[PDB]
Amino acid sequence: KQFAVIGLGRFGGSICKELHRMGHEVLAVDINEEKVNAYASYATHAVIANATEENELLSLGIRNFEYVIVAIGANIQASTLTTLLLKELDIPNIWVKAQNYYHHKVLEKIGADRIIHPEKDMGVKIAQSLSDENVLNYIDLSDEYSIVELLATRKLDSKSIIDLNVRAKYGCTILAIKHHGDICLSPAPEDIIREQDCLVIMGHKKDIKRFENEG
Amino acid sequence: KQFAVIGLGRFGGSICKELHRMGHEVLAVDINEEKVNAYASYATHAVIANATEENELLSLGIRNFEYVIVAIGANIQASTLTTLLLKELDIPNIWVKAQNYYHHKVLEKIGADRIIHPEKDMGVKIAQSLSDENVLNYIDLSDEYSIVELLATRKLDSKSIIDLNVRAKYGCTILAIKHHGDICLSPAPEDIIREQDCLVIMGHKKDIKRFENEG
Amino acid sequence: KQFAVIGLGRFGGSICKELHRMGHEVLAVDINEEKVNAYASYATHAVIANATEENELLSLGIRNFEYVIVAIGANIQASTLTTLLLKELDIPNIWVKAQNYYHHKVLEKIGADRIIHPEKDMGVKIAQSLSDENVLNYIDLSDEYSIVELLATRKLDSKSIIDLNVRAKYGCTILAIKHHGDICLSPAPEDIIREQDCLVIMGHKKDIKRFENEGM
Amino acid sequence: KQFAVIGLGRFGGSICKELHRMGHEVLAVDINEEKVNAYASYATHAVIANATEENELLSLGIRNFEYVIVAIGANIQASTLTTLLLKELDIPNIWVKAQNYYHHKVLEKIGADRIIHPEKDMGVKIAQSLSDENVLNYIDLSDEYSIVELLATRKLDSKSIIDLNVRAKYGCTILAIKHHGDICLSPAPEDIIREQDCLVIMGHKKDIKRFENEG
Numbered sequence: 001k002q003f004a005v006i007g008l009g010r011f012g013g014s015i016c017k018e019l020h021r022m023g024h025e026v027l028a029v030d031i032n033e034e035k036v037n038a039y040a041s042y043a044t045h046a047v048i049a050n051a052t053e054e055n056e057l058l059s060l061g062i063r064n065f066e067y068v069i070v071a072i073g074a075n076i077q078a079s080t081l082t083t084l085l086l087k088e089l090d091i092p093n094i095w096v097k098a099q100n101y102y103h104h105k106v107l108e109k110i111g112a113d114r115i116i117h118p119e120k121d122m123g124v125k126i127a128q129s130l131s132d133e134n135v136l137n138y139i140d141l142s143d144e145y146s147i148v149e150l151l152a153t154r155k156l157d158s159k160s161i162i163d164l165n166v167r168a169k170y171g172c173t174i175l176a177i178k179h180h181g182d183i184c185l186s187p188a189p190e191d192i193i194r195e196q197d198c199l200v201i202m203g204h205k206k207d208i209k210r211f212e213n214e215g
Numbered sequence: 216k217q218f219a220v221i222g223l224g225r226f227g228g229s230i231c232k233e234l235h236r237m238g239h240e241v242l243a244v245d246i247n248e249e250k251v252n253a254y255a256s257y258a259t260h261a262v263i264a265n266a267t268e269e270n271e272l273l274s275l276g277i278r279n280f281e282y283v284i285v286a287i288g289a290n291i292q293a294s295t296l297t298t299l300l301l302k303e304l305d306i307p308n309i310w311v312k313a314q315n316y317y318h319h320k321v322l323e324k325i326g327a328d329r330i331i332h333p334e335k336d337m338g339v340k341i342a343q344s345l346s347d348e349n350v351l352n353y354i355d356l357s358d359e360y361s362i363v364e365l366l367a368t369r370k371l372d373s374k375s376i377i378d379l380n381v382r383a384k385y386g387c388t389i390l391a392i393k394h395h396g397d398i399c400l401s402p403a404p405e406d407i408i409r410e411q412d413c414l415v416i417m418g419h420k421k422d423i424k425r426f427e428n429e430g
Numbered sequence: 431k432q433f434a435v436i437g438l439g440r441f442g443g444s445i446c447k448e449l450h451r452m453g454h455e456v457l458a459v460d461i462n463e464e465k466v467n468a469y470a471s472y473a474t475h476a477v478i479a480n481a482t483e484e485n486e487l488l489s490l491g492i493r494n495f496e497y498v499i500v501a502i503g504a505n506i507q508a509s510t511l512t513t514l515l516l517k518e519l520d521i522p523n524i525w526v527k528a529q530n531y532y533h534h535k536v537l538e539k540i541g542a543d544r545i546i547h548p549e550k551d552m553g554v555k556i557a558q559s560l561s562d563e564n565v566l567n568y569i570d571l572s573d574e575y576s577i578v579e580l581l582a583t584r585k586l587d588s589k590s591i592i593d594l595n596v597r598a599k600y601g602c603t604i605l606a607i608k609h610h611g612d613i614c615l616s617p618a619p620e621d622i623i624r625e626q627d628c629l630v631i632m633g634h635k636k637d638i639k640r641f642e643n644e645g646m
Numbered sequence: 647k648q649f650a651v652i653g654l655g656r657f658g659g660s661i662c663k664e665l666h667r668m669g670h671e672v673l674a675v676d677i678n679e680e681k682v683n684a685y686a687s688y689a690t691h692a693v694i695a696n697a698t699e700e701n702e703l704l705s706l707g708i709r710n711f712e713y714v715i716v717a718i719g720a721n722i723q724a725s726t727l728t729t730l731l732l733k734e735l736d737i738p739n740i741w742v743k744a745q746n747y748y749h750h751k752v753l754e755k756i757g758a759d760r761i762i763h764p765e766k767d768m769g770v771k772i773a774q775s776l777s778d779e780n781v782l783n784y785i786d787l788s789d790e791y792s793i794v795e796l797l798a799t800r801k802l803d804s805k806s807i808i809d810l811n812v813r814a815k816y817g818c819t820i821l822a823i824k825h826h827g828d829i830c831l832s833p834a835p836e837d838i839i840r841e842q843d844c845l846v847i848m849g850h851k852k853d854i855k856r857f858e859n860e861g
């Protein structure tokens with residue numbers, strides 16, 4: 001797998017550093033000279049080039065990369081013209097960072113394989129923690145079911161799993177407990193619930209909220 | 216709970232729209248006139264003000280908000296001076312959006328309760344999907360254990376749960392199956408695994424990778 | 431002693447010229463090309479570099495300097511990020527030029543050994559001379575005692591030291607008299623006070639003001 | 647005494663706040679709207695005006711002020727044109743903040759009563775403390791004699807005044823000792839010298855340096 005990242009920003013630079021850490025060949029492309037020099041050591045190859053030019057894009061050997069990431073989310077003209085050239089160049093996978101709803105629709109028309117909203121997806125996840133301080137991190141399996149890593153309160157201290165009727169009343173399944181750095185996968189009845197540690201639970205979205213308010 | 220969001224960007228504007236959707240009193244503060252007019256309908260109160268000024272900050276009644284979110288991640292001078300005033304004004308919870316590693320350290324010194332890297336955290340999560348196309352969304356319970364929502368391949372088609380020795384060999388637990396829009400929580404042996412649907416699994420980080428390569 | 435001065439402004443450039451005059455090894459760092467060329471002859475080593483970058487800061491050998499002066503007082507982002515790198519690099523002495531009260535508090539949190547307000551300290555000293563024209567230069571020993579270099583008026587002309595009851599009534603001690611270029615340290619009774627020359631006095635802050643209004 | 651300060655900068659704003667604290671009528675003049683609003687409460691009268699215009703300068707009643715301070719030290723054209731109008735308007739006392747050596751000479755030609763270099767005078771005083779850490783604050787009585795407020799070292803601990811032969815050998819007079827917040831004016835023999843407190847001394851410039859190195 002050969003990866004090309006166009007645009008070394010906060011989002012683009014994180015992909016280059018993470019993929020290079022895992023041991024992948026990453027091409028870092030940016031129009032700014034200072035950005036390329038900073039990420040020269042964090043990428044296999046770093047080039048100062050303009051992605052809106054077809055002649056400069058063909059000089060990079062961009063046709064040899066299966067995955068090309070266009071991490072430009074503040075210049076719609078630069079982002080949409082870059083993916084038009086890549087779609088014309090028959091790139092199998094083009095992942096684009098969008099800015100707003102209208103930028104999402106333009107990329108969908110010109111053939112974006114995946115469109116990413118980094119700030120919008122984090123803003124929704126952060127606001128869920130702001131509304132309810134009991135949650136720490138959640139993953140939406142569907143629109144009605146999710147896995148929520150809850151935080152143990154004072155009333156749940158010194159309580160066994162069998163004492164909590166999550167399975168019968170709330171219809172939720174306890175998944176894991178992070179006992180002060182110790183992690184137990186699929187706890188068996190019964191385990192004592194300690195102080196403010198991570199409590200992983202699984203259930204319906206409305207059913208978990210009932211457990212937070214009541215249990 | 217009263218929330219104040221300073222800076223209506225891509226990350227700041229997502230928090231205002233999400234918290235207002237859930238039914239919370241949100242104060243939207245931005246120095247740009249066009250940003251405030253766009254988010255006037257998506258916030259309880261929208262004010263055009265400079266957060267670096269103490270006189271303007273006290274005119275907003277900012278001492279009445281438990282949670283203040285400083286979503287400025289491109290101006291270090293504006294972000295650090297804003298949180299210094301809020302820390303001096305005894306705000307119980309200050310959440311700041313950072314830019315880089317050095318911006319993270321300055322906010323930690325001047326008393327930031329939580330520091331958020333929206334683009335950096337998404338860039339790591341996106342790069343995990345780029346490296347392995349089988350994964351769709353994952354949550355890190357710890358540094359060695361995670362819950363990964365996998366994608367079913369062709370070799371797993373028409374296969375029962377008892378056929379897959381994830382519990383014995385790989386030491387991983389199957390959590391949920393998204394059967395073409397139908398979601399089954401904690402499947403019982405045995406369930407037939409269909410085509411390319413979401414397969415939620417739980418196990419050690421190295422153990423899940425063995426299941427992806429072999430199973 | 432090796433000194434590094436970051437930012438060649440009106441305040442930063444004065445430190446480079448004064449330390450080089452006394453015979454010290456001074457490193458002059460500035461982001462502006464014209465500033466470095468002007469102070470190239472007034473510093474041991476002058477480099478065009480950005481102090482907010484760790485890679486550029488390590489290329490200067492900045493870990494070999496005991497005293498680093500960050501004389502940036504108009505860019506808070508550049509000033510605070512520079513001192514964060516120096517504090518991370520274990521610089522024994524970091525002296526920072528601040529802009530306002532809020533800039534002073536940020537530098538105190540991130541570990542500034544000394545914070546300097548050049549314009550604010552001069553503005554207070556100048557305003558003391560504006561309010562009272564009799565004073566010329568003063569040093570605050572404490573919040574209630576100071577040494578004030580006064581200016582002799584017409585009523586103090588042809589007056590002896592013993593005639594002035596500064597020691598008994600005002601409780602102030604006359605320290606030195608600059609008699610037209612001639613300086614007398616610790617004058618003995620009695621010395622004739624001439625025309626408008628420098629009269630150094632020492633006493634309580636409220637006691638000196640009584641001498642200016644009544645005696646002077 | 648009526649004071650007018652033209653230019654509300656770091657140096658100009660300090661004069662307005664100090665003179666208003668002492669109870670003087672201060673006129674604050676600045677071309678920037680935000681500067682005038684900030685110093686409106688710290689001055690008797692604050693006006694947004696351009697000092698280079700004679701019509702605007704006469705609208706302030708500037709002929710009624712004995713002392714006018716032109717605290718502009720980054721715009722030579724604005725600083726020199728302002729003092730030309732004031733000299734033409736017969737202001738008894740004009741104090742100007744200069745920028746460099748060439749700005750000092752222009753103001754001297756066009757009739758500046760006093761020219762001030764705030765950053766240059768502080769830079770010399772700071773560099774004296776940088777070269778010798780024993781000094782704290784000094785005042786130059788002349789080019790060869792000065793009063794230096796020294797810092798007591800470890801070798802001067804538990805030492806009497808009569809033990810130190812400053813009067814005979816070094817020819818210097820000890821003026822005051824700040825004994826941990828207690829200040830003694832003109833100490834009499836003998837007083838014990840404690841740890842790192844302020845030691846005020848008076849003598850020749852070369853004679854004090856000998857005391858620092860030897861005594």
Ligand SMILES: Nc1ncnc2c1ncn2[C@@H]1O[C@H](COP(=O)(O)OP(=O)(O)OP(=O)(O)O)[C@@H](O)[C@H]1O
Pocket residue numbers: 006007008009010011012013029030031032035049050051052071072073074075078334
């Ligand atoms: N035409 C272009 N070709 C290559 N790189 C470009 C081009 N235009 C912009 N870039 C670079 O892409 C990077 C990211 O762009 P930009 O800062 O506009 O987006 P962003 O949405 O603010 O980014 P992030 O949120 O990741 O910080 C920058 O380093 C910029 O220099």
Ligand SMILES: Nc1ncnc2c1ncn2[C@@H]1O[C@H](COP(=O)(O)OP(=O)(O)OP(=O)(O)O)[C@@H](O)[C@H]1O
Pocket residue numbers: 119221222223224225226227244245246247250264265266267286287288289290293
């Ligand atoms: N001092 C300030 N007070 C209030 N709002 C400000 C201030 N400075 C900037 N803003 C606003 O905050 C918002 C976010 O800041 P900015 O665009 O600089 O950061 P960013 O990290 O690029 O944003 P994003 O959330 O889009 O990633 C912008 O709408 C900007 O106008």
Ligand SMILES: Nc1ncnc2c1ncn2[C@@H]1O[C@H](COP(=O)(O)OP(=O)(O)OP(=O)(O)O)[C@@H](O)[C@H]1O
Pocket residue numbers: 436437438439440441442459460461462465479480481482501502503504505508765
């Ligand atoms: N990041 C930086 N690294 C090094 N030098 C810098 C940096 N940013 C600015 N400088 C330089 O530092 C010098 C002083 O900064 P600046 O002029 O902004 O402050 P100031 O308070 O107006 O200065 P002064 O009152 O001493 O004239 C300038 O010559 C400027 O070019």
Ligand SMILES: Nc1ncnc2c1ncn2[C@@H]1O[C@H](COP(=O)(O)OP(=O)(O)OP(=O)(O)O)[C@@H](O)[C@H]1O
Pocket residue numbers: 549652653654655656657658675676677678681695696697698717718719720721724
């Ligand atoms: N023509 C003018 N009339 C009145 N005020 C002016 C004029 N031009 C500039 N000013 C103001 O004078 C003030 C000081 O000027 P400036 O900031 O350029 O000088 P400086 O030497 O850098 O300042 P500082 O006193 O902070 O060292 C500023 O607030 C500026 O807006």
Ligand code: NA
Pocket residue numbers: 010119225334
């Ligand atoms: Na962004």
Ligand code: NA
Pocket residue numbers: 440549656765
């Ligand atoms: Na200045």
